[PDB]
Design a binder for this molecule. Structure first.
Ligand SMILES: O=C(NCc1ccc(Br)cc1)N1CCN(Cc2cc(F)cc(F)c2)CC1
Ligand SMILES: O=C(NCc1ccc(Br)cc1)N1CCN(Cc2cc(F)cc(F)c2)CC1
Ligand SMILES: O=C(NCc1ccc(Br)cc1)N1CCN(Cc2cc(F)cc(F)c2)CC1
Ligand SMILES: O=C(NCc1ccc(Br)cc1)N1CCN(Cc2cc(F)cc(F)c2)CC1
Ligand SMILES: O=C(NCc1ccc(Br)cc1)N1CCN(Cc2cc(F)cc(F)c2)CC1
Ligand SMILES: O=C(NCc1ccc(Br)cc1)N1CCN(Cc2cc(F)cc(F)c2)CC1
Ligand SMILES: O=C(NCc1ccc(Br)cc1)N1CCN(Cc2cc(F)cc(F)c2)CC1
Ligand SMILES: O=C(NCc1ccc(Br)cc1)N1CCN(Cc2cc(F)cc(F)c2)CC1
Ligand SMILES: O=C(NCc1ccc(Br)cc1)N1CCN(Cc2cc(F)cc(F)c2)CC1
Ligand SMILES: O=C(NCc1ccc(Br)cc1)N1CCN(Cc2cc(F)cc(F)c2)CC1
Ligand SMILES: [Mg+2]
Ligand SMILES: [Mg+2]
Ligand SMILES: [Mg+2]
Ligand SMILES: [Mg+2]
Lengths: 176, 179, 174, 180, 180, 177, 177, 181, 175, 177
């Protein structure tokens, strides 16, 4: 994990991407990742409350409450958010992908998307699961019944299938 | 420890990998995982913003690794407009050979003693097969071989020499030195 | 802790400014990557000035060693190789691959051409690549190389000189 | 934690870790076990110091239980390759390859502090192990001026020598309490 | 995490970690176990301080359970080699090699705080272990002014001395609550 | 080391001797291995006599729910009266087994502690199991299911007297009558 | 410690050996080559004692190694004997395949068991194994390949009643008739 | 992995055997799990014991193995050829690598698989030595399958399993059985 | 799990083989294996000082002094010793194979034999010289040939080992 | 796994059979556990006969000095002649035990190696133990303390012939006479 430095002032390359309003959600989501992503989103809003923010997602998912913290922050800030699926968006990753601004949810052609979810009481685990159903229903425009049925299936969707389902808007090979 | 080198601009000190990045060289050395993919993708996108026309060099010495991470790099290579020169040094196996093959036509290179493997050295069963079919389609597109030939070749647990890989359509040039 | 010398450089970076590249310890992909980056950087600083490669290595990963070997042949520069301590397995291949006339050992070094999850056929193909490379740089026949590599032993610098692995055994400069 | 010190130069004030400051005084430390990593660092320092001046003495401080023989021999060969006088100093102990480096200092310039201990005993195929051992015998014979027979016999004994005994043996020249 | 402090210099402000700042005041810390790495660092600091001034006192703070005997002896020999007066201070404890270093301070300049504890008891081949032990007896005899017989008997007892008892024994000179 | 005892002569390890007196021990955490052993013992004792009572000694913090349910189903499958005894504690699945003894034959010693709370696969499946537990506790305690669900949310133990009033057990005994 | 029991001359058996004597074979726990070897040896031994008498297979398993499960399955089909399968606790993955492979009419579950047909080398070989499972489930459940494939994609358990309706088992029993 | 005990009626009364020892009394030898020197030693000891009990009666070898150490597999193979007895081999679950070699080395006509087994002839010191061992395997497979060395070499390069029917056609086994006839 | 066989007396299968005068040297040789092999050889000599003993060898070698302890015991007892190489005999394993009674050293057809060998330096060389002397005695090759051959990191086939003088017969089945 | 042998019938593990022949093995490192066992065997053999020789087989790198001294003292305490045999090696405390056999009855096989060199307590106590070893070697070898001290400093092995000349053993035997 040596991070290359680029000259524009010298920045590590992730800090340079942040200057272009790009936030990376790569790898598992936990409280530490959520904290960082939230800090970046709030910083970018203060730099400009109108300019779009790009969120790059390559994630197998992770901790549900951490994912929900990022989701709530995405909705709290005013900015348009362009989400991009590269590699995969599974579990909480696909929720974040779906939560991008309508018209601005993107996937590359070979990505895979999973809405399936591969110590607390049983009732609390179900309450969290219902929160996920409600969020997916809101952003995909599918019924709760369809979301519940689809999330039970242990499978990935192609980008085209995810587009038809309402998780994303555009499948792009290159810019138009 | 990464050595530091000085470039004349006054003088600026770079670690040697950052200096290579300044020359439009991106390294894909070692196993491919999400962390490596993230770094390679960031570098490719940065280089495109510096110039959407100038070639980018991708050095590949890799046993492969995580398929979805490899596909993320592959999709980024196709997304950016730039010519990409791929170079096989040491080995390109599994996802490494896919990236090698995905360089711009005419600009896929190997050094003379490298070894290339398209075999994948041994989620639900159906999903594993879907990924495998995606690999077949990508190799078919860039090698110009049929799906039948690719499927048969990938079943064989072997490496190809650079000349063999050239004949197969994985690369274009086997170079001892510059022309 | 790496000492700093005086612009302030860590001592390995200072050696690199003097066109010295170190191949100390086991060779793996990470070492190969670093050595290759240094060789290519030094070529861009000057495609004519000699590069010094210091080798103290028990060997390591064959494909990583071959990546360094191919880079040594790719760049135009004269490469002076130096054996200090030992050059075994892939280390001795790199030593032998220096520019003719510029392959050196210190007097107490030891050199080994013996090699102390892939298919049997692929292991043999790699071994044959090593035979061909040693034959080319030592000027010995394939038969002699194959026989010598079977023997689990080190050569002294003088014996390695007679074999064609190196050119000069030096106590001090002339 | 390595303390940082400030030195006054021709270009102003510069901050060095204390080992880097010692290197500026032409002092090279060989403390702890000798392996390829230590040899690499010591060799780089010796070659750097030669380039700063091929005439000025270099001080080598040795407190070592020994270590890897080929790594020790790499340092030894570098000591002989550079032109500079090398003052060796035994502090604490010089055992196995450490005592070889101590003995390899420039004649007249091999030193020990009074309470140091020196060991020439040494605490791949059989033939190759013997070849290395014979190389050590030859090097000790050359620098101590003792016969091969005496060196071989002495190296078999699992013991340390005092600085005075090491002086009489030809490993070092001076046992010093303070400067003259 | 080591706090940073700011000093005013000829060029403006310089930031030192607090141990480096103490070194600028000629204070060398010997806290924790003594091994070759600690000895190397302490020796480098003592030699640096001698080069800054061969007359100004050096303060050595000792809070140590002891450690490696040859490493302790390397520090001891360096303390005797440099010309400078050395004030030793026992804070917390000085046990085994720690108490040897404490006792080796310049006569009149060996100090303890009131609640410290001092141990001269000490918590390779048999002959070599005894030779080292005899070196310790000789050093304690020299600096405490007690006979070899008394030192040998005292070192057999698995116990600590109070600062007052250590003063009476000849290990230290002053037990201080605050400056005079 | 398990001591050996002699019966009038045959030598048994002491647990095997207890088994001869129709005593089955459920001590420690419940997992598939414990369930297998307990089930084998219950079925063996039924074959020796389908009428004679079986004593089940329970000192358990609970454990794997499906393993506990396997024991529970076996207790209901065999015809025999089963006397359950709480010694030390019966928590989580342990208290379910205690409650599942034959009515009138569920016992605790005076200093035992009983917990019906479950100290904290897909979410839906975790809830299905939890609902199965509610139904079983309701059946054997004779409390409405609404009361069971509320009580199981409370992270606490009951004394033997409180567990008796709740319908988990029938008798709190210091010694035999 | 495995308790020892006495059978009537008196002979002392460990309790699992006593069960084997009653023609009961336990498949409790993860299935791997070692478990398969033991189960196969027991089935073949029981066939040699009598090629007509029923054999009882008790299943409490989360599944395990597919080829090991298939070795047991093939042995069940090879021997002539009627095989009564019993689900206690759970039968998941390969466990539910063995349950379903009992003799028609003789596949049983206790009331609180859970059954899963979902399944929690090169890609082509993994798919070939998966297709073998589809074919076996189709044969014993009498469902179509399409229905089996769809059902196996769903990460869920079935109740015993739902498994009965699906064709995995024949009887859900609280006690003997 | 507690091994059940079974009781047999003898001339002197009752004898208790662990179930594997009981199978050995019926001339059944198990090769289950990875093959290493320890497994080879036990299998070899059992084959030689069974030969001494009768040099004519068939021996059954049950194979469920991913393979393992090549020299250990070859030790078992050589023992199978050394004893005079007919050896019936049975593939249950899988026979991969050295496991499939042992399966193929059963007496002609007596090599069996159950219907859902999988067979692999692919194989998932100095380089020259590794090749010498590999050539020994080619020669053994050629002898027992009756295929050419060229066909064996090509087939062993492919990282795949064969079904029992495909293994039958290849010459690795003779019969694929659901139940006895 | 070691199977038990009945002869009534019940023996584990290795103990049954010992009743047939078979001693197994399978796996690495260390002091514990040497102790067991030596005890078995001495026991078999006491049962009969004339009847042959069979030693089965499948070993990568191991501790030199432990191997030499077995070797010395083989020479001490009067009995003919038939050695059998199954799988491999490498390093000390091949020394034991070669030390069988002349005419009674056997290999199965697919075994591999290695005489190459994959404290202070002087003591390591003394042990190595002891091995040279023992191989020279039992193979009838010169010290020079043994030293040269042991330097080569390779295995011999049974036929090559026969020609070298390590063994006498390569057998597919009994005659 | 220790093989079992039959004597004319009683079945012994092979080490117990050797003990029946008055053979005690000291193979492997010497620690308190090994000492305890050897001492028990020596005392048992003395009670069977206080006159018949005992054979001690030594293949040992040495080990704990006080444990070795416990065995040594027991060898001297019992009346019996003790034949010591070096097979493989006798190093450190192993060579002390070898040397402590009855005069005329200390044996080595031809390829054995013997080392008298010794490859938390206070320094003084370590020296006291070392002096005890010097005294014991002097007594049994008949060499002076000065010669023993000098020889023990040398990190080397002796051949059986050299050990014979030194006074550690009496006979180097290829086979019985
Ligand atoms: O201070 C600000 N906004 C101004 C600002 C300016 C520069 C930066 Br950097 C960060 C925030 N806010 C940011 C919003 N925050 C609430 C919050 C917190 C949070 F974790 C998530 C949210 F969506 C929202 C309360 C305080
Ligand atoms: O904003 C830009 N490009 C401009 C730019 C300028 C400087 C830098 Br540094 C990085 C990007 N894009 C780059 C393309 N990106 C989508 C994307 C994301 C991705 F992960 C892979 C892709 F191939 C493409 C969306 C945002
Ligand atoms: O960009 C350059 N050369 C110019 C240059 C200038 C400054 C630096 Br720093 C590095 C390279 N090349 C360097 C050679 N590279 C191919 C290559 C790659 C490689 F890994 C090994 C090789 F021997 C050769 C293709 C691109
Ligand atoms: O370049 C130089 N000398 C000049 C120089 C200037 C500044 C520095 Br920093 C280092 C060396 N040499 C130094 C000697 N080196 C060979 C060598 C290498 C080595 F590892 C040990 C040696 F004793 C000698 C070849 C190159
Ligand atoms: O070079 C010097 N002294 C001058 C000097 C000036 C600045 C610094 Br920083 C260090 C030393 N000496 C320092 C003493 N050293 C011998 C030595 C070494 C040692 F490890 C301990 C000692 F007590 C003494 C020999 C070289
Ligand atoms: O074999 C018998 N009963 C007779 C018997 C006699 C001696 C013994 Br020991 C065990 C059982 N049954 C017992 C009931 N069993 C089904 C069963 C299995 C099970 F795991 C739990 C149950 F509650 C019931 C089927 C076969
Ligand atoms: O020997 C027999 N049957 C007789 C018998 C008698 C007592 C016992 Br115990 C075991 C077997 N057969 C049984 C079937 N076996 C092949 C076999 C092996 C196998 F692993 C699974 C099978 F379904 C079938 C071949 C040998
Ligand atoms: O002693 C016998 N045969 C008789 C016999 C009788 C009962 C038993 Br149990 C074992 C062997 N032989 C058996 C064959 N053996 C050599 C051998 C050893 C071996 F490991 C594999 C082989 F194929 C052959 C030599 C001694
Ligand atoms: O007591 C006997 N022989 C008779 C005998 C009888 C039954 C048994 Br069991 C063991 C030995 N000897 C056996 C040989 N032993 C010396 C010995 C020991 C040894 F470890 C290896 C040897 F080659 C020889 C001396 C005592
Ligand atoms: O009771 C006896 N001897 C009689 C006896 C009879 C049968 C047996 Br078995 C063991 C001892 N003694 C044996 C000697 N023992 C003292 C002893 C103990 C010891 F550990 C070592 C010794 F050298 C001596 C005191 C008790
Ligand atoms: Mg103490
Ligand atoms: Mg709680
Ligand atoms: Mg799942
Ligand atoms: Mg493979």
């Amino acid at each position: 994990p040596l991070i290359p430095i680029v000259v524009e002032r010298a920045y590590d390359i992730y800090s340079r991407l942040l200057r272009e309003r790009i936030v990376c959600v790569m790898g598992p989501i936990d409280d530490s990742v959520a904290s960082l992503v939230i800090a970046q989103l709030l910083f970018l809003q203060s730099e400009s409350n109108k300019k779009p923010i790009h969120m790059y997602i390559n994630s197998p998912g992770g901790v549900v409450t951490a994912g929900l913290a990022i989701y709530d922050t995405m909705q709290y800030i005013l900015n348009p958010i362009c989400t991009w699926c590269v590699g995969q968006a599974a579990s909480m990753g696909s929720l974040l992908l779906a939560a991008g601004t309508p018209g601005m949810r993107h996937s590359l052609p070979n990505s895979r998307i999973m809405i399936h979810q591969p110590a607390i009481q049983a009732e609390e685990i179900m309450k969290l699961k219902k929160q996920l159903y409600n969020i997916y229903a809101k952003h995909t425009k599918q019924s709760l019944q369809v979301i519940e049925s689809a999330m039970e299936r242990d499978r990935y969707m192609s980008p085209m299938e995810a587009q038809e389902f309402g998780i994303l808007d555009k499948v792009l090979v290159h810019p138009p």
